[PDB]
Amino acid sequence: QPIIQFDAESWEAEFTQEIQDKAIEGLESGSVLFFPKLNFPLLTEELKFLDPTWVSNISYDPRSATLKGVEGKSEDLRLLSGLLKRYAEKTAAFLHLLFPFYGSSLKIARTSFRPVEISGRATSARKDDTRLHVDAFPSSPTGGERILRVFSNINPQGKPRSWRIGEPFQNYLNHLLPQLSPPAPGKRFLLYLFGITKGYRSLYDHYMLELHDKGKLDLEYQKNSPQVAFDFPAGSTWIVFTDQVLHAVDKGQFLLEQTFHLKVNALKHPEKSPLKLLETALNKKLVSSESFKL
Numbered sequence: 585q586p587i588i589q590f591d592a593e594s595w596e597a598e599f600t601q602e603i604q605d606k607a608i609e610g611l612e613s614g615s616v617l618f619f620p621k622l623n624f625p626l627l628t629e630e631l632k633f634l635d636p637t638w639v640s641n642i643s644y645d646p647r648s649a650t651l652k653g654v655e656g657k658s659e660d661l662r663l664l665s666g667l668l669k670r671y672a673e674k675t676a677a678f679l680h681l682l683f684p685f686y687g688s689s690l691k692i693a694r695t696s697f698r699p700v701e702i703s704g705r706a707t708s709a710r711k712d713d714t715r716l717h718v719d720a721f722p723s724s725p726t727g728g729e730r731i732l733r734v735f736s737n738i739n740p741q742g743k744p745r746s747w748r749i750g751e752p753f754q755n756y757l758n759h760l761l762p763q764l765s766p767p768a769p770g771k772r773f774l775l776y777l778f779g780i781t782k783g784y785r786s787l788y789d790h791y792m793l794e795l796h797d798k799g800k801l802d803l804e805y806q807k808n809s810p811q812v813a814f815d816f817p818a819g820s821t822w823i824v825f826t827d828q829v830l831h832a833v834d835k836g837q838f839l840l841e842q843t844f845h846l847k848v849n850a851l852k853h854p855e856k857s858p859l860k861l862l863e864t865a866l867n868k869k870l871v872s873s874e875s876f877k878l
C-alpha cells in the first residue's frame with residue numbers, strides 16, 4: 585500500500601496505539617503516511633515569503649538556529665528563521681506523539697523551504713528530482729542512519745504537489761544490482777581528506793549513491809517501472825523514509841520540509857532498512873562504525 589491515509593488534523597494530535605501501530609508499520613514498510621487535513625498555517629507577516637525571489641533553496645538548522653541560503657534585512661531573516669523554526673518544532677512534536685517507539689532516537693536535522701515552482705526545473709540527470717530515486721547526497725553520507733522527512737504543501741492558491749511513488753526498495757535494488765560496482769580503492773578516503781564529503785562515505789553510502797544515480801540514468805526503468813502518481817493537496821502533510829521510498833516530484837510550488845535522522849537499531853524492524861537489505865544482498869558489513877552485537 586503505497587499511501588496510507590490518516591485523519592489527524594492537528595500538530596498536537598493525540599494518537600491511539602492502534603494508529604501509532606499503523607503508522608510505524610506503514611512507515612517501516614516503505615509507505616507514505618498521508619495527512620490530508622494537517623495544514624501548516626503561516627502568520628500574516630510570513631506571507632511575503634511566498635515568493636521565489638528569496639532564494640539566493642532556503643535551509644535552517646534547528647540544532648544551531650542558523651539560517652542559510654537567503655540574503656536580506658535582519659528583521660526579514662528573523663521572520664524567516666522563525667517560520668522554519670516553528671516548522672521544526674511542530675514536526676518534531678508531531679513525530680514524538682505519533683512514534684513513541686522511537687523515543688529520543690529521532691534526531692532533527694535540516695529544515696527546508698522550497699518556494700520555486702517544480703514544473704519549470706531542468707538540470708543534470710543525477711539531481712533531476714523528476715526522476716524516481718531514493719535520497720542519497722554525495723556531500724553528506726549518512727553512515728547508515730535513516731533519512732526521515734516530513735513534508736507540508738503550503739501553496740496559497742490551492743495547487744497540489746504532484747509526486748510519483750515507485751516500487752518497493754527491494755525490487756529497485758534487485759533491478760539495479762547488475763549495474764552496481766565497488767568504489768575505486770582509496771577514492772572515498774580522498775573525498776574525505778579533501779572535504780568533498782562531510783565525514784567518510786561508507787560503503788553503504790557509496791551503494792545508495794550508485795542506486796540513486798544509476799536509477800536516474802536508467803531511462804527504461806524510469807519510464808516503465810511500477811509507479812503511482814499522487815497529488816498532495818495544498819494544506820496537507822506527509823511523512824516518508826525518503827531513503828527507502830522511491831519518489832519523484834513533477835509539479836508544485838511552496839513546500840516546507842523537515843529532515844530527521846534515526847539509527848537503524850532504533851527501528852521496530854531493522855531488517856527492512858536499506859542498510860540491512862544492502863548488507864544482506866552483498867553479504868557484508870557496509871558501515872565501519874557499526875556497533876557490534878555479541
Ligand SMILES: O=C(O)CCC(=O)C(=O)O
Nearest residue numbers: 713719745826832833839
Ligand atoms: O520537492 C519535492 O516535493 C520532493 C523532492 C525530493 O525528492 C526530496 O525532498 O527528497
Ligand SMILES: [Fe+3]
Nearest residue numbers: 713718719826
Ligand atoms: Fe528525494
